[PDB]
Design a protein around this nucleic acid. Structure first.
Ligand SMILES: [Cl-]
Ligand SMILES: [Cl-]
Ligand SMILES: [Mg+2]
Ligand SMILES: [Zn+2]
Ligand SMILES: [Zn+2]
Ligand SMILES: [Zn+2]
Length: 395
DNA sequence: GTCGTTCGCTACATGTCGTCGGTCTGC
DNA sequence: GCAGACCGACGACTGTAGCGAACGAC
């Protein structure tokens, strides 16, 4: 069976997240969005484990189900050097063992959903490998709390330890990450880092797995690519839409080149703020080869359907009009990805004509995109002639 | 034209832990 | 004067109450 899974979300116990991020709401929104699998997130926090055991029913010792949505145990932790890492746990026994194993290196493990571990990246990865916990650098290029902002290579961070994936992040896709030769041996994950269950947040990126059943072991085989199981697709936000795609200032969000950045010594002149290096420039720094492996699954860049609806209707992303149109699209059809990539534009025009024209413009790459940087998301705008012209003469 | 509804935007939170300036201090 | 301790503020890790103001079904 073919399932869409999002293995990186944060519960309401984490910081800077929404209080609505609870198991029932998450399951409802993932079901309405067409998301078959969602990682639990914050699994090290015992209160979130209690909420999971309450609001879910066991599929096996490591997979749970709530409101028809399956859930595997995932978590994100912060390094002694402020480097975020993602962990997938086989069973709840492994969750509890790893939790008790790191209580002597953390002070907020029972307090926050995203804990701070006073442990080296190598140490955390070794503790995960010993317990068969899958570990990988989460949002591995962001300039604030990533691996490649602190270290220059995966070996420099993990040393003799082993990692089982690399979360690409919003501002990256599989090709630019494959610009680093080591990554050719590593499976990619494209997750959402969801802090809100809203349309454009939960499942903004996901992984399309081929599995026999939706259980942790099947997902693990698919990530490793064994026994027929495989990650057959990597869907994600277009790299330009990300918060840190280009180098820009952290205060005024003015885009600077890498040359101008090193010239200004990372000081925004007309702002007085810290300018942070974009993930594109970082990858170009760490560039290794112009080649990339063939077994790599494709990466379908997508813009959130709610964002396209808000840009066509000329209204805010949270408005009731865009929410109503989004719900009508998700009722008439299956999922956001289907409406964005697979569905023919004539079928989209039955629900809304302007949205269909914008989706055609996004498919044909005739949609203006101002890239994001420094912490500001990229923006999508449509030309006038795309909206004022009919659909027949469009292509 | 009424007057509930919806919109867009600004301000603020909520704890740990870096970073990055400015300040004390002990020489 | 100066090295170096010390220190406070500031933002990532983003979401949303809540507040004038426009809207839009009577
Ligand atoms: Cl570095
Ligand atoms: Cl194996
Ligand atoms: Mg992406
Ligand atoms: Zn993170
Ligand atoms: Zn996260
Ligand atoms: Zn600036």
């Amino acid at each position: 069976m073919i399932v869409d899974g999002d293995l990186h979300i944060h519960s309401h116990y984490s910081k800077a997240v929404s209080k609505l991020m609870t198991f029932p709401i998450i399951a409802e929104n993932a079901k309405l969005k067409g998301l078959n699998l969602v990682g639990t997130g914050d699994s090290l926090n015992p209160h979130w484990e209690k909420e999971l055991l309450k609001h879910s029913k066991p599929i096996d010792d490591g997979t749970f189900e709530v409101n028809g949505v399956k859930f595997i145990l995932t978590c994100e932790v912060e390094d002694k050097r402020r480097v975020h890492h993602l962990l997938i746990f086989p069973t709840l026994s492994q969750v509890r063992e790893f939790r008790e194993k790191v209580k002597i290196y953390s002070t907020n493990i029972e307090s926050e959903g995203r804990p701070n571990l006073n442990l080296t990246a190598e140490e955390i990865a070794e503790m995960a490998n010993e317990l068969d916990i899958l570990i990988g650098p989460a949002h591995a290029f962001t300039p604030w709390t990533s691996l490649y902002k602190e270290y220059d290579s995966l070996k420099d961070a993990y040393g003799d330890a082993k990692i089982d994936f690399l979360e690409l992040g919003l501002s990256a896709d599989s090709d630019m990450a494959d610009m680093i030769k080591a990554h050719h041996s590593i499976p990619y994950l494209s997750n959402s880092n969801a802090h809100s269950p809203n349309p454009h947040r939960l499942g903004r990126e996901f992984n399309r797995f081929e599995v026999k059943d939706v259980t942790f072991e099947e997902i693990r085989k698919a990530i490793k690519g064994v026994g027929g199981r495989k990650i057959m697709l990597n869907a994600g936000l277009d790299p330009r839409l990300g918060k840190y795609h280009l180098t820009a200032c952290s205060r005024c969000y003015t885009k600077y080149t890498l040359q101008d950045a090193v010239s200004l010594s990372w000081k925004c002149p007309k702002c007085g703020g810290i300018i942070k290096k974009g993930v594109r420039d970082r990858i170009l720094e760490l560039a290794d080869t112009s080649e990339k492996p063939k077994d790599r699954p494709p990466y379908v860049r997508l813009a959130p359907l709610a964002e396209i609806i808000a840009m066509v209707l000329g209204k805010g992303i949270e408005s009731k009009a865009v929410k109503l149109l989004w719900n009508r699209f998700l009722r008439e059809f299956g999922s956001e990805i289907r409406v964005l990539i697979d569905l023919p534009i004539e079928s989209i025009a039955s629900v809304h004509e302007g949205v269909a024209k914008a989706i055609w413009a996004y498919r044909n790459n005739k949609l203006i995109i101002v890239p994001g940087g420094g912490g500001k998301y990229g923006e999508i705008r449509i030309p006038e002639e795309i909206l004022k012209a009919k659909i027949e003469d469009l292509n």
